[PDB]
């Protein structure tokens, strides 16, 4: 519509700017897409605009990288197996201040820019929180003027496209490069060899890794624009390519596929270590090519590796790139011929490690035999690291043999394994958790032994989200009513949102907050109708739980509440209840039968609830298909209630929680992860906090969790388990949910029933507030106004000062 | 050098043209290659110029295709499994008249354009003659203003890169898309489904092909510029892509490779049918996607399929796309619901078939079981075609049962097979050979039965080469001395070269012809030094045999001559002989042990000859590595003597013969293929014709070829076989050549020894003429001057008028 073109936060439609954009658009359509308007599809128009927008950061990208070469700052390398980037077109336009100019130029050409934006494929190179965190981090590091590089893998297929067929998840290949990627620049001239297998021989000079198989790593560079500071940083993603030279000639050519399979697809396993050789190869591939780049940049600067930690930070996003530690030692000792002790000093001062979960099944514990076959030299180095590290433990804690056994990089058993978390702590000068409660649990329990050896190593860095994608882009309406009162500085200084507490009693701001939410809901309600012919009641409370499907996130607890609301309506059909649209979305890991069963249960509950004429428009429950970064940008601004209901102690931080808080949703949740700090910032009176705290969970584990006690004492819970058992939600297959029932009653590691009573009552309080629109909106104002801490600019500023030793700067390039 | 910039045939360096080219060059380097001159490699500079040159044909390409849509001419579809295109940059510049402007613009930027041209990968999507013929044909059809489309497969790997290691061929993957292809435009929006396997069911309506596996065919469009007529035609190459939807999720994603393997690599088997399922899939893939395109274009024009043959010609390059015939019948009968007899009338009037060899092992004879599994509906249609075709044979030739058995599409035996040549003749209104002697043998022997049923079907179309790539581009020096005398019209009217017979006695032209040859030889001699550190004597006769390595091409006969020259020098070291550099090059099919042994024999003869101090610079024999279109453009203009020495009756035409004739080489050859017509055009007195004619070969077959008789009667031959046997050319492995010796003495299908005596004497006459430079050059003038018939413009004009029913035109577009 025109209205959106009038949005001040979207910048200026300069006459000359608009004229040049139209000309460059038409130029790309003719010379780049080789089409005239006669035959051009919306896809052609999307690509013409994407090429036009990309041209506007080429000068800045070249100048930024030239500026780092000349000024030689310390370089930050963010190593991750995942970059959950989403779409690039709107983000680029926001960060370059081109959004209103492009909007006007496309409008004058007869085009709806927002329809074109829907054509762009997500770069879905992530599973969830960790991947999206890497993405928010690249944006904040560019905005803070850091000389920062994202390093990862250019997966041919990202996280699988989820279809729901017969109420079940079906997985399809996320063919995101089908139509090409206008953002990336292939750098095949900067291709590097990566080695696999082979053997270690010992020459006059020392160890030599020989007889290896080569896979080439071909880098692809994507631009990362800072917010209006003329800074354009690089995300470098490596693509696997079969080496130059070699069933027959034909089979040998087809067999190039096996090496190229290394970058073929993202492992969709979110919170579970599988131990697949191909995943190990992906981890070594990204670490090996990346560290060659890092060493090359270091040596072409203003040799003596003493200065390497003053010019390089390597940040390990989880244990996935943990092989950086032995790889850096391998390069320094075997190729640069440093003494072991000097090499180790350099390695520890270079590397830092971010831990993202305490869940034991997440821990990377590679079989020694697999390491011995694939990476023989890395295994030798790991054993040497282990010897020297345990010698330090023995000196600090003389005769504490149990501690030596617990701290060892080597795990004894039927299969001997390397603990990659232990390797990361040993080879890193800093270890951080991703929220205060998580970082304290790391020092208290999980890494207590490591904390006692080296307390100075252990840090907190509470996660954050970029206010650019998660407010200005996704919710320009809310960004606009904020700018109208406090100006635009908050977009890169989010603590300025605290100025909004001055408007808790301002009739105009109260009106405007509620109006923006209603607009967002009408647009999302429309979306469901247009793309899925799904009708939702737009005067309903939007109750949203979007995140990966896991027992620990307790989508099942949400299911028990939804069926509780259904059964209360049936018992007292005459009694008024606040109408709800309950939306659950997210992907289940291919495999995880239980996660796939929970998706079927959500759709099955919907099948009953949504067709009961007594319920009608008072309650609707819908499974949002293919939850991904692009769909998060649509549903989160439309949300009234944010479900953050993980068992206390299980969610290290969460970032979806922060997105909802920034976009004018109230939160129902446990005192878990960053929920604790969110409630602290806003005041607990402005959060719907319920359920067991970590210490209540621990007291239940101490005496044993008996789900039967809850079943016996709670009539409403008993009625629901009996509906699930007897086939009420699967009449044509009455035993369909027996595995869910049996897990809840006898094998529930996440104590669903133990929080049921507090959850249902807490949800009653939510409904009671929603019936009072003014006080609902006033409480929302108090949440948005205190969301500033959860800016990833704040997080990155802390990494820069406390771990990397660099000073951030919002000062602009010319 | 500057001199080449002064070449009038290379066009004008307009001041504004040069200024715009430099600006667009710098523009591409910044916005396309994202590099500033600081860091730019010669590769960046090549790509910047390629993008700049490509931009200059975008308007013409769009207008040409729009012009065909509006004027609705009959469309020519040239279906081939091979397009042996070579490099595109220089060809584009020649056809757009930009060569001197680009040369000047790059010069002003401090760049050598010819060094940049060496960076471009050949599009090596061909094996040899048939593939390069398809390439010359696209060029001539554009130059003749035909509404012509090349349709083929976008192989990820073309013909293998040949390395010589220890004197043996080694094959490497021809990774021609490593750095990208600036010429092609991906059209993923015009992606089409191709079906494989499945089964035939019979509904109310008729046959239905069901339960198939889908492979997507994604088209890539390359421009084909005519010579300065503003015409830009299309080569559409299909890429295999796994369908949208589906060992586990991960194995299912990796298994997309199996479908994508269909377009992975060119079968390097030049003159041998192998019967590989994957080759059958490539043949159906190109035919199926192509015929969907053809039908779509037909229906979006100014339904009734009665007009289809008035608006479509399908030219089948060999039997490789022979499935077009049953596929067109399948579409017309099963999907468009035409009566069988009407469908057949349409199919025969649409399709024509070009035969390229009489060698039995070349004939495509697919097992019926393979067809039944992969293409069940095509097999049914082929059986129906066969029934109706043999019914016509039975009516024409009542009671001739032997003729029914010989003409059948179905070949009886242990394995029953479909003869694809028989299918092509049945389903085509025209059948042609590729030289007069070949086309007459087709009517006399191979297809005699078919000629007798339908004599009107059988045509000759003598092959040709484009005078653009094979004279103006590769030999601008010779193009220039010709233009100086007769102007530039000959470049698209090559019969104008006959005007050069007026200069046989012209002292200045004689001087200039010899000077251009000497320049070409000095440049090729330099090339060997720069790229291979190989020294050649530049006052030596350049004796060149470049072509695929096959027993029928008799590289071995050349080897016996080279060793004859070596042994004569050793016997009479004091006797003067014309110094020679004997150059043999070409690829052996992976497999063909004998072809690989012949390459080793050439290098082994070189190892002795090139290190014998008695011989010194008087005789050098070198194996030219990686013979391909780009290397043909270098060596052929430097050649003095063209070896075309195939056994009479074995080479259908040849095109290398024509390239040498156009570039000022004299020819030693058999009365075989187009050699016959070349000698007829120039006068036999201007050719070194030797050896058995077809009827002498036939008389030897009638009484039996006994190689021993030649061995017993020829002392010099006996001495050579004994050197090969005893290990003179393999001292460290004395029996290394026993298989070559045993084949020559007992299993020689190509009668090498039978032409030995005439060959050696004919070579004596060559040397005798070379000792007289004036008369050598005068005879060259008489060859170049009469090469005009062998223009592919002449060939295409004949296809257009005699088979396609369209009138050619050199008249320009605005
Ligand atoms: O930021 C948002 C928020 C939303 O709730 C929606 C958004 C974008 O775009 C969708 C959409 C789909 C299409 O298929 C279109 O063509 C189109 O223009 C917009 C739909 O309106 C819902
Ligand atoms: O048409 C011809 C004819 C030839 O005989 C040669 C040609 C081109 O280019 C080669 C060459 C190789 C390189 O590596 C270069 O850099 C370069 O400029 C030229 C070499 O001179 C030999």
Numbering used by the authors:
A (entry chain A), B (entry chain A): 7 to 252, 260 to 315, 324 to 835
Task: Show me the paper's own sentences about this structure.
Glycogen phosphorylase (GP; EC 2.4.1.1) is the enzyme that catalyzes the first step of glycogenolysis toward the production of glucose-1-phosphate. GP has several ligand-binding sites that can be exploited for inhibitor binding. The structures of rmGPb-EGCG and rmGPb-EGC complexes were determined by X-ray crystallography, showing binding at the quercetin binding site (QBS) in agreement with kinetic studies that revealed both compounds as noncompetitive inhibitors of GP, with EGCG also causing a significant reduction in cell viability and migration of U87-MG glioblastoma cells.
The 2Fo–Fc map also showed that EGC binds at the QBS although a high concentration of EGC (15 mM, 3× more than EGCG) was needed in order to achieve binding, reflecting its low potency toward GP. EGC forms 22 less van der Waals interactions (overall 85, 7 polar–polar, 37 nonpolar–nonpolar, and 41 polar–nonpolar) compared to EGCG. The lack of the gallate group and its hydroxyls explains differences mostly in polar interactions and also in hb bonding. EGC forms 3 hb with protein residues in comparison to 5 of EGCG. The hydroxyl oxygen O19 of ring A makes 2 water-bridged interactions: the water-bridged interactions O19-Wat1037-Cys495 (O) and the water-bridged interactions O19-Wat1847-Leu494 (O) and the hydrogen-bridged interactions 1 hb with Wat1848. In addition, (O21) forms 1 hb with Wat1103, and the overall EGC forms 8 hb interactions. Arg551 is at a 3.58 Å distance from ring B and Lys544 is at a distance of 3.23 Å from ring A, participating in π–cation interactions. Superposition of the binary complexes of rmGPb-EGCG with rmGPb-EGC reveals a shift (RMSD, 3.31 Å) of the Glu120(OE2) side chain upon EGCG binding due to its hydrogen-bonding interaction with hydroxyl oxygen (O44) of the gallate group.
